Structures are given as C-alpha cells and as structure tokens.
Coordinates of C-alpha atoms and ligand atoms in Angstrom, one line a residue:
Chain A
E1 CA 121.6 104.8 93.4
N2 CA 120.4 103.3 96.6
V3 CA 117.0 101.8 95.5
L4 CA 114.6 101.4 98.4
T5 CA 112.0 98.6 98.0
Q6 CA 109.1 98.6 100.5
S7 CA 107.0 95.6 101.4
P8 CA 104.2 95.4 100.9
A9 CA 102.8 98.1 98.6
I10 CA 99.4 97.8 100.1
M11 CA 98.1 96.3 103.3
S12 CA 95.2 96.5 105.7
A13 CA 94.7 96.2 109.5
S14 CA 91.8 96.1 112.0
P15 CA 92.1 98.4 115.0
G16 CA 94.4 96.9 117.7
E17 CA 96.3 94.6 115.2
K18 CA 100.1 94.9 115.2
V19 CA 101.5 96.0 111.9
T20 CA 105.0 95.7 110.4
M21 CA 106.1 97.1 107.1
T22 CA 109.7 96.8 105.8
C23 CA 112.2 98.7 103.7
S24 CA 115.0 96.8 102.0
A25 CA 117.9 98.8 100.6
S26 CA 120.2 97.8 97.7
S27 CA 123.3 99.3 99.4
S28 CA 123.9 99.1 103.1
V29 CA 123.1 102.2 105.1
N30 CA 123.5 102.9 108.8
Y31 CA 120.4 105.1 109.4
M32 CA 116.8 104.9 107.9
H33 CA 114.1 107.5 108.0
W34 CA 110.3 107.3 107.6
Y35 CA 107.7 109.7 106.5
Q36 CA 103.8 109.5 106.9
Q37 CA 101.6 111.1 104.2
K38 CA 97.9 111.5 104.2
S39 CA 95.9 112.0 101.0
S40 CA 98.1 114.1 98.7
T41 CA 99.1 116.7 101.4
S42 CA 102.8 117.2 102.6
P43 CA 104.7 114.3 104.2
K44 CA 105.4 114.6 107.9
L45 CA 108.7 113.3 109.3
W46 CA 107.8 110.3 111.4
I47 CA 110.9 108.4 112.4
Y48 CA 114.6 109.4 112.0
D49 CA 117.8 107.7 112.7
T50 CA 116.1 104.3 112.4
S51 CA 114.2 104.5 115.7
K52 CA 113.9 108.0 117.1
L53 CA 110.3 109.3 117.1
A54 CA 109.8 112.8 115.6
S55 CA 107.9 115.5 117.3
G56 CA 104.2 114.6 117.6
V57 CA 104.4 110.8 117.0
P58 CA 102.6 108.5 119.4
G59 CA 104.4 105.9 121.4
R60 CA 102.7 103.0 119.5
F61 CA 105.1 103.7 116.6
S62 CA 108.6 102.4 116.5
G63 CA 111.4 101.7 114.0
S64 CA 114.3 99.3 113.8
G65 CA 116.9 97.6 111.6
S66 CA 120.5 97.7 110.3
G67 CA 122.5 97.5 107.1
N68 CA 120.2 96.3 104.3
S69 CA 116.9 95.8 106.1
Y70 CA 114.7 98.2 108.1
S71 CA 111.2 98.3 109.4
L72 CA 108.5 100.5 110.9
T73 CA 106.1 98.9 113.4
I74 CA 102.8 100.0 115.0
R75 CA 102.0 98.3 118.3
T76 CA 98.3 98.6 117.9
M77 CA 96.7 99.9 114.7
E78 CA 94.5 102.9 115.2
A79 CA 92.1 104.7 112.8
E80 CA 94.3 107.9 112.5
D81 CA 97.3 105.7 111.3
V82 CA 95.7 105.4 107.8
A83 CA 98.4 106.8 105.5
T84 CA 101.1 106.0 103.1
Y85 CA 104.5 105.5 104.8
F86 CA 107.8 106.2 102.9
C87 CA 111.3 105.1 103.9
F88 CA 114.2 107.4 103.1
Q89 CA 118.0 107.4 103.1
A90 CA 120.3 110.4 103.4
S91 CA 123.5 108.4 103.8
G92 CA 124.6 108.9 100.2
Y93 CA 123.7 110.8 97.1
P94 CA 121.2 110.7 95.5
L95 CA 118.9 110.8 98.4
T96 CA 116.2 108.3 97.8
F97 CA 112.7 107.3 98.9
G98 CA 110.9 104.0 98.9
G99 CA 107.8 103.5 96.8
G100 CA 105.7 103.7 100.0
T101 CA 103.6 101.3 101.9
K102 CA 99.9 102.2 101.9
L103 CA 98.1 101.4 105.2
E104 CA 94.3 101.1 105.2
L105 CA 91.8 99.9 107.8
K106 CA 90.0 96.6 107.9
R107 CA 86.3 96.3 108.3
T108 CA 83.5 93.9 107.3
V109 CA 82.1 93.2 103.8
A110 CA 79.6 95.8 102.5
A111 CA 77.7 95.7 99.3
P112 CA 77.3 98.9 97.2
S113 CA 74.2 100.9 96.7
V114 CA 73.8 101.4 93.0
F115 CA 72.5 104.6 91.3
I116 CA 72.4 105.6 87.6
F117 CA 72.1 109.1 86.1
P118 CA 70.9 109.9 82.6
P119 CA 72.7 112.8 81.0
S120 CA 71.5 116.2 81.7
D121 CA 69.3 118.1 79.2
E122 CA 72.0 120.8 79.8
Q123 CA 74.8 118.6 78.4
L124 CA 72.7 117.2 75.5
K125 CA 72.2 120.7 74.0
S126 CA 76.1 120.9 73.8
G127 CA 76.4 117.7 71.7
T128 CA 77.8 115.1 74.2
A129 CA 76.1 112.5 76.6
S130 CA 77.7 111.3 79.8
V131 CA 76.0 108.5 81.7
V132 CA 77.1 108.0 85.3
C133 CA 76.9 104.9 87.5
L134 CA 77.5 105.5 91.2
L135 CA 78.5 102.6 93.5
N136 CA 78.3 103.8 97.1
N137 CA 79.8 102.7 100.4
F138 CA 81.3 99.2 99.6
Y139 CA 84.2 97.2 101.0
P140 CA 86.5 95.8 99.9
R141 CA 87.9 97.9 96.9
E142 CA 87.5 95.5 94.0
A143 CA 84.3 96.0 91.9
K144 CA 83.4 95.3 88.3
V145 CA 81.1 97.7 86.5
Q146 CA 80.1 97.0 82.8
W147 CA 77.7 98.8 80.6
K148 CA 74.8 97.7 78.4
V149 CA 73.1 99.8 75.8
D150 CA 70.0 98.0 74.4
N151 CA 71.6 94.9 75.9
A152 CA 74.8 95.3 73.8
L153 CA 77.9 95.2 75.9
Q154 CA 80.1 98.4 75.8
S155 CA 83.9 98.3 75.8
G156 CA 86.5 101.0 76.3
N157 CA 83.9 103.9 76.2
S158 CA 83.8 104.2 80.0
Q159 CA 86.1 105.1 82.9
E160 CA 86.1 104.6 86.6
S161 CA 87.2 106.7 89.5
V162 CA 87.5 105.6 93.2
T163 CA 87.4 107.4 96.6
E164 CA 90.1 106.9 99.2
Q165 CA 88.8 104.8 102.1
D166 CA 86.2 106.9 103.8
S167 CA 87.3 108.1 107.2
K168 CA 83.9 107.7 109.1
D169 CA 83.0 104.1 108.0
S170 CA 86.1 102.8 106.2
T171 CA 84.4 102.2 102.8
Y172 CA 85.0 103.1 99.2
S173 CA 82.8 104.6 96.5
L174 CA 83.1 104.4 92.7
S175 CA 81.9 106.5 89.7
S176 CA 81.7 105.0 86.2
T177 CA 81.2 107.3 83.3
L178 CA 80.0 105.9 79.9
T179 CA 80.8 108.5 77.2
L180 CA 78.7 108.7 73.9
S181 CA 78.1 111.2 71.2
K182 CA 74.7 113.0 71.3
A183 CA 73.5 111.2 68.1
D184 CA 74.6 107.7 69.3
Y185 CA 72.8 108.1 72.7
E186 CA 69.7 109.3 70.9
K187 CA 69.3 106.1 68.8
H188 CA 68.9 103.6 71.7
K189 CA 66.5 103.1 74.6
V190 CA 67.8 101.0 77.6
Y191 CA 71.0 102.1 79.3
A192 CA 72.1 99.6 82.0
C193 CA 74.8 99.4 84.6
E194 CA 75.7 95.9 85.9
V195 CA 77.8 95.8 89.1
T196 CA 79.5 92.8 90.4
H197 CA 81.0 92.7 93.9
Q198 CA 81.9 90.2 96.6
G199 CA 79.2 91.5 99.1
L200 CA 76.6 90.7 96.5
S201 CA 75.4 87.1 96.0
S202 CA 74.2 88.1 92.6
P203 CA 75.2 91.1 90.4
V204 CA 73.0 94.1 90.6
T205 CA 71.6 95.9 87.6
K206 CA 70.3 99.5 87.3
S207 CA 68.8 101.0 84.2
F208 CA 66.6 103.6 82.6
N209 CA 64.6 104.1 79.4
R210 CA 65.6 107.2 77.6
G211 CA 62.4 109.3 77.7
Chain B
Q1 CA 107.9 128.5 114.1
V2 CA 109.8 127.2 111.1
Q3 CA 107.7 127.7 108.0
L4 CA 108.3 127.2 104.2
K5 CA 106.0 128.2 101.3
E6 CA 106.6 127.6 97.6
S7 CA 105.2 129.8 94.8
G8 CA 105.5 129.0 91.1
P9 CA 103.6 129.1 87.8
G10 CA 101.2 126.1 87.9
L11 CA 101.4 125.5 84.1
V12 CA 104.5 125.9 81.9
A13 CA 105.3 124.8 78.3
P14 CA 107.8 122.0 77.6
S15 CA 111.3 123.4 76.8
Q16 CA 110.6 126.6 78.8
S17 CA 111.8 126.7 82.3
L18 CA 110.1 126.2 85.7
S19 CA 110.9 128.9 88.3
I20 CA 109.8 128.3 91.9
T21 CA 110.5 130.5 94.9
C22 CA 110.5 129.1 98.4
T23 CA 109.9 131.8 101.0
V24 CA 111.0 130.8 104.5
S25 CA 110.9 132.1 108.0
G26 CA 111.9 131.1 111.6
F27 CA 115.4 130.0 110.7
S28 CA 118.4 131.6 108.9
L29 CA 119.5 130.5 105.4
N30 CA 123.1 131.4 106.2
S31 CA 123.2 128.5 108.7
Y32 CA 120.8 126.0 107.2
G33 CA 120.2 123.8 104.1
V34 CA 117.0 123.8 102.1
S35 CA 116.2 120.7 99.9
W36 CA 113.6 120.3 97.2
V37 CA 111.5 117.2 96.6
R38 CA 108.8 116.5 94.0
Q39 CA 105.8 114.1 93.7
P40 CA 104.5 113.2 90.2
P41 CA 100.7 112.9 90.2
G42 CA 99.6 109.7 92.0
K43 CA 103.2 108.5 92.4
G44 CA 105.8 108.6 95.3
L45 CA 108.6 111.1 96.2
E46 CA 111.8 112.1 94.4
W47 CA 114.6 114.3 95.8
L48 CA 115.9 117.0 93.5
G49 CA 118.6 119.0 95.2
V50 CA 119.9 121.0 98.2
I51 CA 121.5 124.3 98.8
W52 CA 123.4 124.3 102.1
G53 CA 124.2 127.3 104.5
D54 CA 127.6 127.8 102.8
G55 CA 126.0 128.3 99.3
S56 CA 127.1 124.9 98.0
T57 CA 124.8 122.6 96.1
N58 CA 124.1 118.8 95.6
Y59 CA 121.8 117.9 92.8
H60 CA 120.2 114.5 91.9
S61 CA 122.4 113.0 89.1
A62 CA 119.5 112.4 86.6
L63 CA 119.1 116.2 86.6
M64 CA 122.6 117.8 87.6
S65 CA 122.7 119.6 84.2
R66 CA 119.1 121.0 83.9
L67 CA 118.6 122.2 87.5
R68 CA 119.9 125.2 89.5
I69 CA 119.3 126.1 93.1
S70 CA 120.2 129.5 94.5
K71 CA 119.1 131.8 97.3
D72 CA 119.1 135.3 98.7
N73 CA 119.7 134.9 102.4
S74 CA 118.5 138.5 103.1
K75 CA 115.2 138.1 101.2
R76 CA 114.6 134.8 103.0
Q77 CA 114.3 133.0 99.6
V78 CA 115.4 129.8 97.9
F79 CA 115.1 129.6 94.1
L80 CA 114.7 126.5 91.9
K81 CA 115.2 126.7 88.2
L82 CA 114.6 123.7 86.0
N83 CA 115.2 123.9 82.2
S84 CA 114.4 121.9 79.1
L85 CA 111.1 120.8 80.6
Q86 CA 109.6 117.4 79.8
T87 CA 106.1 116.1 80.3
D88 CA 107.3 113.9 83.3
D89 CA 108.4 117.1 85.2
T90 CA 104.7 117.4 85.9
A91 CA 104.5 117.1 89.6
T92 CA 103.8 118.8 92.9
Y93 CA 107.1 120.5 94.0
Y94 CA 107.9 121.0 97.8
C95 CA 110.8 122.7 99.6
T96 CA 112.0 121.3 102.9
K97 CA 114.4 121.9 105.7
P98 CA 116.6 119.1 106.9
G99 CA 116.7 118.9 110.7
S100 CA 116.8 115.8 112.8
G101 CA 119.0 113.1 111.2
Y102 CA 119.3 115.3 108.1
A103 CA 115.9 114.0 107.2
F104 CA 113.2 116.5 106.1
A105 CA 111.6 117.8 109.2
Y106 CA 109.7 120.8 107.8
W107 CA 107.8 121.0 104.4
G108 CA 105.9 123.6 102.5
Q109 CA 102.3 122.9 101.2
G110 CA 103.7 122.2 97.7
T111 CA 102.8 123.7 94.2
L112 CA 101.3 121.7 91.5
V113 CA 103.2 122.2 88.2
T114 CA 101.7 120.9 85.0
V115 CA 104.0 120.7 82.0
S116 CA 102.0 121.3 78.8
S117 CA 101.8 123.5 75.7
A118 CA 98.0 123.7 75.7
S119 CA 95.9 126.6 77.0
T120 CA 93.7 126.8 80.1
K121 CA 90.2 125.7 79.8
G122 CA 87.4 126.1 82.4
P123 CA 85.0 123.2 83.0
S124 CA 81.3 122.8 82.1
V125 CA 79.2 121.8 85.1
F126 CA 76.3 119.5 84.7
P127 CA 73.8 118.2 87.3
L128 CA 73.3 114.5 88.1
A129 CA 69.7 114.8 89.2
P130 CA 67.9 112.5 91.7
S131 CA 65.5 109.7 90.6
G138 CA 64.8 106.4 102.0
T139 CA 68.0 107.7 100.4
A140 CA 68.5 109.7 97.2
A141 CA 71.7 110.3 95.4
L142 CA 72.5 113.5 93.5
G143 CA 75.7 115.2 92.2
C144 CA 77.7 117.4 89.9
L145 CA 79.6 116.4 86.8
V146 CA 82.6 118.6 86.1
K147 CA 83.7 118.1 82.5
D148 CA 86.6 119.2 80.2
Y149 CA 88.9 121.4 82.3
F150 CA 92.7 121.9 82.1
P151 CA 94.9 121.9 84.1
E152 CA 94.2 120.6 87.7
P153 CA 92.8 121.3 90.2
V154 CA 89.2 121.9 90.8
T155 CA 87.6 122.1 94.2
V156 CA 84.0 121.2 94.8
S157 CA 81.8 122.0 97.9
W158 CA 78.1 121.7 98.6
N159 CA 76.0 124.7 99.9
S160 CA 79.1 126.7 100.4
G161 CA 80.8 124.2 102.9
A162 CA 77.6 123.6 104.9
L163 CA 77.1 120.1 103.6
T164 CA 79.8 117.5 104.2
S165 CA 78.0 114.6 105.6
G166 CA 77.7 112.0 102.8
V167 CA 79.7 113.8 100.1
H168 CA 82.0 111.9 97.9
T169 CA 84.2 114.0 95.5
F170 CA 86.0 111.7 93.1
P171 CA 89.5 112.1 92.0
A172 CA 89.8 113.5 88.5
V173 CA 90.0 111.2 85.6
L174 CA 91.9 112.0 82.3
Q175 CA 89.8 111.9 79.2
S176 CA 90.7 111.1 75.6
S177 CA 90.5 114.8 74.8
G178 CA 93.5 115.2 77.2
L179 CA 91.1 117.2 79.4
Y180 CA 90.1 116.3 83.0
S181 CA 86.6 115.4 84.3
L182 CA 85.4 114.8 87.9
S183 CA 82.2 114.1 89.8
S184 CA 81.0 115.0 93.2
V185 CA 78.0 113.2 94.7
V186 CA 76.1 113.4 97.9
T187 CA 73.4 111.2 99.4
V188 CA 70.5 112.8 101.2
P189 CA 67.2 111.6 102.5
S190 CA 64.5 111.4 99.8
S191 CA 62.1 113.2 102.1
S192 CA 64.4 116.4 101.9
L193 CA 64.1 116.7 98.1
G194 CA 60.9 118.9 98.4
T195 CA 62.1 121.3 101.1
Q196 CA 65.9 121.4 100.8
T197 CA 68.2 123.2 98.3
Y198 CA 71.4 121.6 97.0
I199 CA 73.9 123.9 95.3
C200 CA 77.4 122.6 94.2
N201 CA 80.2 125.1 94.3
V202 CA 82.9 124.5 91.7
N203 CA 86.0 126.6 91.6
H204 CA 88.7 126.4 88.9
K205 CA 91.4 128.9 89.9
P206 CA 93.6 128.5 86.8
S207 CA 90.8 129.7 84.4
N208 CA 89.2 131.9 87.1
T209 CA 85.9 130.0 86.9
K210 CA 83.2 129.9 89.7
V211 CA 80.0 128.2 89.0
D212 CA 77.1 127.3 91.4
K213 CA 74.7 124.8 90.0
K214 CA 71.3 124.3 91.6
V215 CA 70.6 120.6 91.2
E216 CA 66.9 119.9 90.8
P217 CA 64.7 116.7 90.9
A218 CA 64.2 114.9 87.5
Ligands
LIG301 C1 128.1 116.1 109.5 C2 127.8 115.5 108.1 O1 128.6 114.8 107.5 N1 126.7 115.9 107.5 C3 126.3 115.4 106.2 C4 125.2 114.4 106.4 O2 125.8 113.2 106.9 C5 124.9 112.5 107.8 C6 123.9 111.6 107.0 O3 124.5 110.9 106.0 C7 123.2 110.7 108.0 C8 122.0 109.9 107.4 O4 120.9 110.8 107.2 O5 124.2 109.9 108.7 C9 125.1 110.6 109.5 O6 124.5 111.3 110.6 C10 124.0 110.4 111.6 C11 122.6 110.8 112.1 O7 121.6 110.9 111.0 C12 122.7 112.2 112.8 O8 121.5 112.5 113.4 C13 123.8 112.2 113.8 O9 123.9 113.6 114.2 C14 124.5 113.7 115.6 C15 125.7 114.6 115.5 O10 126.9 113.9 114.9 C16 126.1 114.9 116.9 O11 127.2 115.8 116.8 C17 124.9 115.6 117.5 O12 125.3 116.2 118.8 O13 123.9 114.6 117.7 C18 123.4 114.2 116.5 C19 122.3 113.1 116.9 O14 122.9 111.8 117.0 O15 125.0 111.7 113.4 C20 124.9 110.3 112.8 C21 126.4 109.9 112.5 O16 127.1 109.8 113.7 C22 125.9 111.6 108.6 O17 126.6 112.5 109.4 O18 124.6 114.0 105.2 C23 124.1 115.1 104.4 C24 123.4 114.5 103.1 O19 122.3 113.8 103.6 C25 125.2 116.1 104.0 O20 126.1 115.5 103.2 C26 125.8 116.6 105.3 O21 127.0 117.4 105.0 C27 126.8 118.7 104.6 O22 127.7 119.0 103.5 C28 127.6 120.4 103.1 C29 128.4 120.6 101.8 O23 128.0 119.7 100.8 C30 128.0 121.3 104.2 O24 129.3 121.1 104.6 C31 127.1 121.1 105.5 O25 127.4 122.0 106.6 C32 126.4 122.9 107.0 C33 126.0 123.9 105.9 O26 126.9 124.5 105.2 O27 124.8 124.2 105.8 C34 127.3 123.6 108.1 C35 126.4 124.5 109.0 O28 127.1 125.0 110.1 C36 125.3 123.7 109.6 N2 124.5 124.5 110.5 C37 124.4 124.3 111.8 C38 123.6 125.2 112.6 O29 125.1 123.4 112.4 C39 124.4 123.1 108.5 C40 123.3 122.2 109.0 O30 123.9 121.2 109.9 C41 122.6 121.5 107.9 O31 122.2 122.4 106.9 C42 121.4 120.7 108.4 O32 120.4 121.6 108.9 O33 125.3 122.3 107.6 C43 127.1 119.6 105.8 O34 126.1 119.4 106.9

C-alpha cells in the first residue's frame, strides 16, 4: 500500500505569505494529485499530474516533485485558500490519499468573551440539567475551560465543541457543556466557569447563583 | 455538465448490507469509469473501488470480499453493495468520475451512512436565554443519527451565529448548540426563533428564545 504522509498536519499563514506543504510517498510514483476540501463538503480536484492546474484553480497555486517527494505551493496566501489539502496517487492499487494538510489563516491574538447559561426550566422538568459556557471570538485555538460547583472542581462531566475558523474575522468559538442530574444540580448554589487563554493576562470567571 | 448524485439509506444495522445508487448524467457509463470514495466522520479519505467502461472492477484489498460494484448503463446508474457491515463503515460515501490524470475530477454531494443497530431518536430543544452585546442560543440534545441543521429566524439571521459541531454523549446520542450574539438593546423589540430540523426522525421544532 503506498502510504502518503503529508507535512505538516496543521499550519497557518497570513495573507500574502508563501506556503509550501509536502507529500512524501512510501513507494516511488511518477505523478501526484491534490484535492482541496472545505468544511465537510465534496473535495474538488485541484492539481493533477504533479503540476497541471485543474479547471477553476487560480495561478497562485502550483505543484511539483518526483519519485518519493511532492509538494503543493501557494505563491501568496489568500483568505479563500483556507481548506484541507489532500495528496493522492493513482499509479498503483490501492489508490491512496494523504492524511491532509489543514490550512488556516493567521491573525492577531484575541481574548474570548465569556457567557454562561443556567439550564432551562424546560429541561429541568424532564430530569436533566445542562450548564453551557460560551467562549466567543478568540484566537488562537487553544483554550482551557474548567468548571466549579460551590468551588469544587469538576472532572470528566463536561465536553467541549469548537467552531471552524470563522470566515469573516478568522476567529474560533467554543461551547462547554457541564452535565448533571436534576437532583445533583438542585443541591448546590454557585456554578462557575473559569476560562484560561493566551489573550487574557489573568483567567476570566463567569458564574451564577441558582435562584 | 457532468453530474453525479448518490442515494442510500442513511442508517443501517451491522451485519446487514449497505446499498447506494449513484445516478449520473452528462457522460456515458459505457465509455467511463466511476469510482467510490468514503470519508469517516472527522477523518480523511479512503478509496473503495471502481467500475470501468468495460464492466471490470478494481476493489481496495482491505474490502475485495465484502464489496461489489455494478451498473446499468441504460439507467445511468452505478451500484455499490457492501456486506457484513462494521461500526467503522460509518462514513460519508461519494461516487466520482476519473478524468484528468485518472484523478477524481467530478464528485457527488455524498451520503452520510451511520452503522448502528439502534433506533432513530428526535432531539429535545432547549433555549439558552440571555442574561452592549447579549448572547443567546439553542441546545439540541439527545438525537440519533446525524445530522441536524439549525437556522435563526428562518435563514434571516446569519450575522453572528455560531453552530457548533455535534458532540457524542455517554448515552451514545448526539448533542449540539447554536448561539448568536445580538445587541442587548434589541432584546425588547426583536424576536429570535431557532429552526431545528432532524430529517431522519422527521422532527421540526421552532423555539422562541425569551429573556431570563
Ligand atoms: C492507460 C492506462 O494505463 N490507464 C490506467 C491508469 O494508468 C495511469 C495512472 O497510473 C496515472 C497516475 O494517475 O499514470 C499514468 O498516466 C499518466 C497521467 O496521469 C495521464 O494524464 C497521462 O495521460 C495522457 C495520455 O497517455 C495521452 O494519450 C493523452 O493524449 O494525454 C494524456 C495527458 O498527458 O499519461 C501519463 C502516463 O504517460 C497511467 O497511464 O491507471 C488507472 C488506475 O488509476 C487504471 O489502471 C487505468 O487503466 C484502466 O484499466 C481498466 C481495466 O482495469 C480499463 O482497461 C480502462 O480502459 C477504459 C475503460 O474500460 O473504462 C477504456 C475506455 O475506452 C476509456 N474511455 C475513453 C473515452 O477513452 C476509459 C477511460 O479512459 C477511463 O475510464 C478514465 O475516464 O478507460 C483503463 O483506463
């Protein structure tokens, strides 16, 4: 099986920067192909036979390589080039793809705005309580959220979810959901959400009192 | 105008078989190969097989045994049958036409296929009520299988909306939030409805979100 390893998995670039990702093949091939994919929709063919541009692809894109070692290059990074790029060989069976190189846009540090939502009265009637912390419009991606109920640290009773880089302002958003039983929620008072993030000099806390 | 379009079940039980039809147009199956690719949720791409113009077939060796590809050139259709289903056959399936460089030049939309024995389950929808800027949202809890779509005021409100990717709960059910930031001044006058559609259970729910 011709395993295609792509370097790097994840990288960022400001507008106008030159970018170069690589594909490195376990067995020599003579022709490498590349697809571009945006946010779960169908891949588009982007480059075929190592360096020919497909229909629709701007001139800033090119490809190159031989044998074991190929690459896609963008002359000057643009906002609409945010995608995951997959290499592909059809020189022998099985036909194989790379793991993809995810390309995102650089921008400046941005601290999150932090909101916290008590559980609805609608949900409480049904017997569960979900407490939601929203971290909004931050950059870069990495962000620690931990929960406190009456100042006791919670552990593995919450999950995170994260937006793809926003296409207007190039930021992320994060939702954390602390799950409890109706009874357990109803025997404490102060629910708190402590977010830590590089754009903050000191971690920000948001809380509410149950009533 | 080369076009492909897949249609399959969406949810099938393990050990049953997945049947997907690709319906093409703008080229002739007598002269042209159609390939099949799949993408497991949140992972990359895997090639499955091909049926060429002449009727012959090359399958991926991990699967040459559980997979068949066939066609009816007249009906404009390519068929994929995959047996002895496993949980990791869960994936979005595409069909493709090789063109330039024998690389995949044209792709269908894709159909999500979830491999599980469990029954469909529509979500509960709960509001995340507001407290310059105010945040409000919808929590969409305990549905199966994917996907749900969310919109605000029937597509009229897109500025400031973040709909999160779905997270898997301990129940084995999905959950997902959509939030939107608006000005706090607009809470009195304006009306925020969230529009949640779960096609697999046939659920539509419109939740007016009110101030706390
Ligand atoms: C010819 C061949 O061997 N085809 C293989 C194919 O081999 C490729 C592949 O490995 C690539 C890497 O992706 O490397 C070589 O090709 C290079 C370039 O990628 C390619 O663009 C370039 O093409 C030239 C071409 O040679 C010139 O003649 C042309 O004028 O210009 C172009 C542009 O430069 O050539 C490069 C090498 O010099 C390899 O050739 O690999 C795939 C797997 O990925 C298959 O194995 C192909 O072989 C098929 O095998 C099946 C049986 O298993 C059939 O025999 C099939 O034939 C048909 C079919 O039955 O469907 C015959 C039909 O007549 C034909 N239809 C038409 C209208 O021609 C179709 C059709 O060609 C295909 O369905 C694609 O749509 O194929 C074999 O094709």
